[PDB]
Amino acid sequence: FLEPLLIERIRSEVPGLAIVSGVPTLSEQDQPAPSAYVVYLGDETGTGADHQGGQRAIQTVGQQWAVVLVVHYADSSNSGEGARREAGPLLGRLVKALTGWAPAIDVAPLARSARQSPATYASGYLYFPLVFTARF
Amino acid sequence: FLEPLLIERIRSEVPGLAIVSGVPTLSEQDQPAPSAYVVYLGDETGTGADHQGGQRAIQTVGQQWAVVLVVHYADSSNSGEGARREAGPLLGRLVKALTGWAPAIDVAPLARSARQSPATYASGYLYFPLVFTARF
Amino acid sequence: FLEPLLIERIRSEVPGLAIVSGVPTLSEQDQPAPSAYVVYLGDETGTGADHQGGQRAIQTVGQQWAVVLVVHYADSSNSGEGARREAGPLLGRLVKALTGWAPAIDVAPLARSARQSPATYASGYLYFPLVFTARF
Amino acid sequence: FLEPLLIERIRSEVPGLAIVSGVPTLSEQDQPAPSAYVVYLGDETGTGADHQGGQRAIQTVGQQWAVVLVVHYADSSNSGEGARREAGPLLGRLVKALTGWAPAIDVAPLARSARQSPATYASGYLYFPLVFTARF
Amino acid sequence: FLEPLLIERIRSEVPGLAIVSGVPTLSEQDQPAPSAYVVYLGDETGTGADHQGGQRAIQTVGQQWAVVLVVHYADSSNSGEGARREAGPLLGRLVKALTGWAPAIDVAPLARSARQSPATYASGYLYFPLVFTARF
Amino acid sequence: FLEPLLIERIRSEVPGLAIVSGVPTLSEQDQPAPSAYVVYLGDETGTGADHQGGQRAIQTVGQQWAVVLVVHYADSSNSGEGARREAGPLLGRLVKALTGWAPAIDVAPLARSARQSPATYASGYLYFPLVFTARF
């Protein structure tokens, strides 16, 4: 219950052309700019372990959080050259800022996943079903 | 089955500009005032324990209850400065009045959660998936 | 399979102004009169116990049945004074007539719940998620 | 796989005024005649018992089948007098013809339920959630 | 992965009047001809047995497949005489051609069910919820 | 998280007449060309085994991926001659390129299924519910 203090800098208006898009199916044909395009998948819950405490019946609630990549630059049905090759550094930047960059945390792990996040394509332009953990 | 006696003062017409809004997705762009914006999540049920009694097959039914924060003041895609920093006292007020302030209760715990209620943002303005327990 | 014989008197046309309303979301703003406003929640089923018999594979089927309270008299966003305080006797009348007043019953318990039926408000006028058992 | 031979007489055009109604929510206000008004609930399945055989992986499949009663004669919001009191013989006729009257059956029990079939009212005119077994 | 070689003869344009109907609710009132009217129910899956192998994590997947009978000849709300009595040979033909007539099969059982396939009527003209297995 | 490097060549614009079709129900009557027509089925997940590791709570996530075949050439309600007989080599090409052709993979098995992928027809022209594994 303290993430906003760092979320403020986590979010930095990634797209320069998209304005008031309310970003978080994709168009892939008329998007003004390659915005972050965050997505939500689900949640993780469990008890009967170190997560659960005493009063208030709360536990360390597992949280899910994913993103969608929209570049379509150098990849317009030609080949996957420049779609993720350029994203690599961008993917690292996104995964390091939006996740893994947490405030002073005691019971808020803010789990981050640098690797082991497979993504498969479809629709003929670009799909990226990212899989990351939040834990908070 | 006695909460209304204190609910009467729990609710005190938080918004001064919103009238007959039937508050309990959000707009985040044309809301007249920062109302309480309460939300409902689910329920908790269980038997075979101290909750269950004899006749009437009733038990201490776990109840879920959450809220949504809508301020968008000092936080208009600029930064999370003034969104929750000002809410902190307001969040405490809300969580202490709407929850944890119960009448003479014998089997109505009215559980309250001051901490351990994480919230994540999205849509580019403000999201707050509050997680609180009611137990009644 | 004999409840109608007493249901006939259970139902007595509670509202004097509402006519052919087909009562069993609520409006809370243009309702002519405070009708009973019965609601249905679900069912309870189980076997491998005294409920199950021999032939016909039938058992004492648990039945769920609830009501909604619509008074909005002395409680019009002012305070919860007169909403349930006046309902108390009315709630007892409803729960004693509609439930617990059964015909000659051998395997039809017709369970009734005088207490332990919590209700929470929302929408800014009145909500009452009653929880009662029927067992038949 | 032989029921039609007796279904032919099971069905005998109960309503005299309803024509091509395709009977199997109810109106309760403009129905020409009190038709049978059969309804379907679900199915029952199980293996690892005498139901399952050898080849073809088939078993004695439990089947669910219910009916809806629509009389609204002598019961028009007045009282439950003549709604089920007259139905009693009619209910027996329906449950004995539509169910329990099976052809030469070896693995087709065609279970019938004379009693233990509770029904609850609602909507202000008449409801009858009949519960019967078919087993085939 | 070889069924088409025999499916080619399995399907033989059963209806002579229905053209480009895309057959696999029914009308029962304006159908030009009594087509096969195949239907799909679900699937059967399982592991940890002889079905599962080594690589490719595949197993002998249970497959469900059913049909709907539409004759309405000699059975037009009169009686079930000629609806299934004439279908009997037709039902055998359908169940022997569409199922049980498989190519050279090693791990494709193509299960067939001659008997033990109950069907119940409704809607006042004809219903036939056939239950057959495919296993492939 | 490296598949695109080979996906780039996996996808090679199979249809020559279909342009900007956004391929991944089918029409089967006005399709310009026999495109790949990939489909998605679901996912496979599991823990408590060699899949799960230490930090990041990730595991070798099972992935599902299937295709739909649309040829309708030499098979136009005549017979299944030329529908899959010609597809055989095409099916092998598709299953070898789109699957089983993976980059340098350490924890990305990219499972491929040459056989044991049954497909059943329906709708009167062509259906092919392919079943393949991706594991990544």
H, E, C per residue of B22-70: CCCCCCCCCCCCCCCCEECCCEECCCCCCCCCCHHHCCCCEEEEEECCC
Query: CA B67 to CA B91: how far, in whole Å?
Result: 10
What resolution in angstrom units was achieved for this structure? 4.0
Exposure of B29 by Cβ count < 10 A (0-12 exposed, 13-18 middle, 19+ buried)? exposed
Suggest the residue from B60, B65, B120, B136 to mutate for an interface test with chain A (most A CBs closer than 10 A).
Answer: B120
For F13, the closest of A77, A112, A121 (CB atoms) is A77
The residue among F132, F120, F122 whose CA lies nearest residue F26 is F122
The residue among B70, B85, B81, B3 whose CA lies nearest residue B37 is B70
Residues F42, F35: contact at Cβ < 8 Å? no
The residue among A64, A57, A66 whose CA lies nearest residue A127 is A66
Contact residues for B105 (Cβ-Cβ < 8 A; gap 6+): B2, B136
Suggest the residue from E67, E121, E127 to mutate for an interface test with chain D (most D CBs closer than 10 A).
Answer: E121
Residues C35, D77: contact at Cβ < 8 Å? no
Tokens representing C117 are 């039926």
The residue among E97, E95, E101, E96 whose CA lies nearest residue E131 is E95
The chain E residues in contact with chain F (CB within 8 A) are: 1, 3-5, 7-9, 11, 13, 20-24, 38, 40, 53, 56-58, 61, 63, 65, 107-108, 134, 136
The chain B residues in contact with chain C (CB within 8 A) are: 1, 3-5, 7-9, 11, 13, 20-24, 38, 40, 53, 56-58, 61, 63, 65, 107-108, 134, 136
Sign of CA dihedral A122, A127, A133, A134: negative
Instruction: List Cα–Cα distances, B62 to B107, B109, B110, B134, in angstroms.
Output: 11, 10, 9, 7
The residue among E33, E62, E45, E65 whose CA lies nearest residue E129 is E65
Tokens representing F15 are 């249809």
Contact present, F and C (at least 3 Cβ pairs less than 8 Å): no
Exposure of A121 by Cβ count < 10 A (0-12 exposed, 13-18 middle, 19+ buried)? buried
The residue among D116, D80, D94, D92 whose CA lies nearest residue D24 is D94
Residues A15, A21: contact at Cβ < 8 Å? yes
CB contact under 8 A, A81 and F8: yes
Tokens representing A17 are 């052309």
Query: CA C71 to CA C69: how far, in whole Å?
Result: 6
Query: CA D33 to CA D45: how far, in whole Å?
Result: 36
Question: DSSP for F115-133?
Answer: S-------TTS------EE
Q: Any idea what the Cα angle at residue D64 is, between residues D58 and D67, rounded to 5°?
A: 155
Residues E70, E31: contact at Cβ < 8 Å? yes
Which helix (H) or strand (E) segment holds residue F62: the answer is strand F62-67
Residues E99, E65: contact at Cβ < 8 Å? yes
Query: CA A128 to CA A119: how far, in whole Å?
Result: 5
CB contact under 8 A, B123 and A22: yes
Those chains having 3 or more beta-carbon pairs within 8 angstroms of chain F are: A, E
What burial letters (b/e) apply to A65-91, b meaning 16+ CB within 10 Å?
Answer: bbbbbbbbeebeeeebebbbeebeeeb
Instruction: List Cα–Cα distances, B16 to B9, B13, B21, C82, in angstroms.
Output: 17, 7, 11, 24
Expressed in angstroms, the distance from the first to the final Cα of chain E is 8
Tokens representing B3 are 């909460």
Half-sphere exposure of C85 (CA within 13 A, CB side): 11
Contact residues for B41 (Cβ-Cβ < 8 A; gap 6+): B64, B65, B66, B131
Q: How many CB pairs under 8 A join A and B?
A: 63
Contact residues for B79 (Cβ-Cβ < 8 A; gap 6+): A8, A9
Query: CA F83 to CA F85: how far, in whole Å?
Result: 6
Residue D77 CB coordination number (10 Å): 12
| Identity at D83, one-letter amino acid code | A
DSSP state of F43: E
DSSP state of E9: H
Residues A60, A107: contact at Cβ < 8 Å? yes
Report how far Cα E122 is from the mean position of its chain's Cα atoms.
19
Query: CA E97 to CA B43: how far, in whole Å?
Result: 53
Query: CA B8 to CA B101: how far, in whole Å?
Result: 12
| Identity at D110, one-letter amino acid code | L
Residues B33, B18: contact at Cβ < 8 Å? yes
3-class DSSP assignment, residue A61: coil
Query: CA A75 to CA A69: how far, in whole Å?
Result: 12
Residues C111, B53: contact at Cβ < 8 Å? no
What burial letters (b/e) apply to E92-110, b meaning 16+ CB within 10 Å?
Answer: eebbebbbeebeeeeebbb
DSSP state of D15: -
For E118, the closest of D13, D38, D136 (CB atoms) is D136
What burial letters (b/e) apply to F95-133, b meaning 16+ CB within 10 Å?
Answer: bebbbeebeeeeebbbbbbeebbbbbbbebbbbbbbbbb
Q: How were these coordinates obtained?
A: cryo-EM
The residue among E81, E115, E109, E119 whose CA lies nearest residue E95 is E115
* Chain C residue with Cα closest to B6: C80
Query: CA C66 to CA C134: how far, in whole Å?
Result: 9
The residue among F68, F60, F135, F59 whose CA lies nearest residue A120 is F135
For E3, the closest of F115, F118, F125 (CB atoms) is F118
Contact residues for E25 (Cβ-Cβ < 8 A; gap 6+): none
3-class DSSP assignment, residue B96: helix
Query: CA D69 to CA D84: how far, in whole Å?
Result: 9
CB contact under 8 A, E23 and F124: yes
Question: DSSP for chain C?
Answer: --THHHHHHH-----SS--S-------SSS-SS----EE---EE---SSTT--SGGG----EEEEEE-----SS-SSS-SSSSSTTHHHHHHHHHHHTSS--SS-SS------SS-------TTS------EE---
3-class DSSP assignment, residue F66: strand
Residue B73 CB coordination number (10 Å): 10
* Chain A residue with Cα closest to B114: A56
**What is the number of H-type helices and E-type strands within chain F?**
2, 4
Q: How many CB pairs under 8 A join A and F?
A: 64
Query: CA B135 to CA E75: how far, in whole Å?
Result: 60
Query: CA D70 to CA D43: how far, in whole Å?
Result: 24
Q: Any idea what the Cα angle at residue B108 is, between residues B102 and B113, rounded to 5°?
A: 65
What burial letters (b/e) apply to D96-134, b meaning 16+ CB within 10 Å?
Answer: ebbbeebeeeeebbbbbbeebbbbbbbebbbbbbbbbbb
Residue E2 CB coordination number (10 Å): 18
Exposure of D17 by Cβ count < 10 A (0-12 exposed, 13-18 middle, 19+ buried)? exposed
* Chain A residue with Cα closest to B130: A1
Residues B85, A6: contact at Cβ < 8 Å? no
Residues C57, D133: contact at Cβ < 8 Å? yes
